[PDB]
Amino acid sequence: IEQEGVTVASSSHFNPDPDAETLYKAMKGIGTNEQAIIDVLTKRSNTQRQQIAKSFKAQFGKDLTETLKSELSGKFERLIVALMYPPYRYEAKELHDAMKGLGTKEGVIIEILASRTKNQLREIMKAYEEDYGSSLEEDIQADTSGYLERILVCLLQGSRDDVSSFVDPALALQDAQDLYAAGEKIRGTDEMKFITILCTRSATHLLRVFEEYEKIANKSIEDSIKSETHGSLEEAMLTVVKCTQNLHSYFAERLYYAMKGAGTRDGTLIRNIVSRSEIDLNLIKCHFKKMYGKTLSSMIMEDTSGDYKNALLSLVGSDP
């Protein structure tokens, strides 16, 4: 389970018992030692933490996550619980939460379905079904509509990483040609062609289309997108583009906008820090600095507070 909260490097040989004991000492009795919880959980890998849960259950008779949900509050709680989830159940849960409440958090569904590989998505899908009873595709279908649903359902189908990934240039020039044909037709009548190309072609193929399109039309693919669609479908198409050009830049941007301007978008902040933790958080950090001047942690230092603040900082790690 290498998808939340790594140490600094990858790991090995490990007695989980002492850590399970510190967590116990920290929550036992009157008053809670939040620093100990931070020092264990944000400095062990997802796998290590899963093993700490097991020692914890056998040594003391209670489930670690439920004790966590029970002892802690606010963002701090949401963050620490988020850390405890296995890599695929975590996204499944966020996906479920998006649809379980009042309104759909479309941003959440877009972010996950578009940023994951076919095989990651496969795992999420199976994790969803086992934990929640129903099919993820059907829930998406019953909870969204229009062309948003079609791109979403297609993004579920699987061929972003199922395709051969070496570029056919006669097909790549056909695609940009088609997209470019759309511009002289009325906005709305071509949206199905955009979806098909954006969701059935590979990333390497797509990069080529973007190059041909720019050669052909004098405008970027981001502009042609804004000219043919609006709203959430636009957000979905723009997302797929950004994830194709630079997946690490997309996340950096998702993180910036969680904190940009007035207020904070904590759910966005948590999901991205936690889930990219043991994949590419060190690259996102690099892209974040380069794109916005300030470091991620520097922005964390100003927009968040308390034990929640310090856990993020410990999670993010040395941000030079």
From Swiss-Prot:
Keyword Calcium: yes
Keywords in alphabetical order: Annexin, Blood coagulation, Calcium, Calcium/phospholipid-binding, Hemostasis, Metal-binding, Repeat
Highest taxon, organism lineage: Eukaryota
GO BP, one annotated term: endosome organization
GO CC list: collagen-containing extracellular matrix; cytoplasm; cytosol; late endosome membrane; plasma membrane; sarcolemma; vesicle membrane
Chain sites annotated for binding Ca(2+): M259, G261, G263, D303
PROSITE patterns xrefs: ANNEXIN_1 (PS00223), ANNEXIN_2 (PS51897)
Disulfide bridges in this chain: none
Annexin repeat residue intervals: 14-85, 86-157, 170-242, 246-317
Domain comment in the entry: A pair of annexin repeats may form one binding site for calcium and phospholipid.
Name of the protein: Annexin A8
Organism: Homo sapiens
Gene giving rise to this polypeptide: ANXA8
